[PDB]
């Protein structure tokens, strides 16, 4: 579904991880809308970010993010056992279409 | 004009003539056409093209202009205050075109 992504990045309690979202020219590069979505395993996703680097109500500081030109990346700062989930990147997709990322799981040992 | 608002006309005693007013300060205005139009070219006879509006990509919206109401009310009040002088101590109003 386009938007190649680090399909599985492992970790442990305590450290920070950067999870990326690779766009070609238009989807991420043209304008500045990106968002990340957390599926609890086998369940419906929910919400943590809008406008790349801001948060809604009900989200902590750890679920940060930033733009890097032709690639946007979530920054799960201080990964813990709660992060057993998959963080889906979605963004503007050129024309008037919204594209969705390929997914990336985060596993905590 | 560097000094306060100026009012100009040939003969204010005549109602036909058009008044021209210079404001002491500008008021910011913005206009937009949010529809993301597209252009296509159709060729006619020799290498003699003609462009026309294609299909509206995305959603449709109405072109609009934005004027800051704070500055606009202040400026309209000042112009009324100035116009009250040449016409002796009457009320002044503004109506549609």
């Amino acid at each position, epitope marked *: 579904s386009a938007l190649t992504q680090p399909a599985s990045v492992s970790g442990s309690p305590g450290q920070s991880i950067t999870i990326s979202c690779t766009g070609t020219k238009y989807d991420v590069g043209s304008h500045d809308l990106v968002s990340w979505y957390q599926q609890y395993p086998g369940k419906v996703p929910k919400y943590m970010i809008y406008e790349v680097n801001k948060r809604p109500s009900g989200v902590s500081n750890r679920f940060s993010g930033s733009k890097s030109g032709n690639t946007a990346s979530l920054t799960i700062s201080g990964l813990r056992a709660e992060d057993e989930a998959d963080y889906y990147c979605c963004s503007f*997709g050129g024309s*008037a279409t919204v594209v969705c990322g390929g*997914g990336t799981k985060v596993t905590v040992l | 004009a560097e000094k306060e608002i100026v009012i100009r006309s040939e003969n204010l005693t005549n109602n036909a003539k058009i008044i021209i007013v210079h404001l002491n300060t500008s008021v910011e205005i913005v206009c937009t056409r949010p529809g993301n139009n597209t252009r296509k070219s159709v060729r006619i006879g020799p290498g003699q093209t003609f462009y026309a509006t294609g299909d509206i990509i*995305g*959603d449709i*919206r109405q072109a609009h202009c934005n004027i800051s109401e704070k500055q606009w009310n202040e400026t309209l009040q000042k112009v009324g205050k100035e116009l009250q002088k040449h016409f002796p101590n009457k009320t002044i109003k503004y109506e549609r075109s």
Partner: nanobody
Amino acid sequence: QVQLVQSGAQMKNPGASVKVSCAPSGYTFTDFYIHWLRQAPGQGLQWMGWMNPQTGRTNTARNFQGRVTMTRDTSIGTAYMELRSLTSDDTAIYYCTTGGWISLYYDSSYYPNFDHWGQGTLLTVS
């Protein structure tokens, strides 16, 4: 504040058209876009098409154009989906979501927020 509560399980055979729907509640229906999302088992979300509820204009991703038809329902709020030329490869859970904010001054259809979700409908085709 917002709850979409869609339909439960649905059953169809290949080649038909499926009526998937979502029942918004807790907010004025004609003030938010409706974005439809696929989730086939094992892969990530794939976007289907945004719906304007005030005016019936719609759009669809290029991988689904023609096959997907949708209509609004302002009386009840339950927007409808129609997936013609159905295939067993479409054995995927279909989602319903509230998009951005509709207004008279700037196009906000592609704003990919997706604030509130539905609970996933297990549609299997064979």
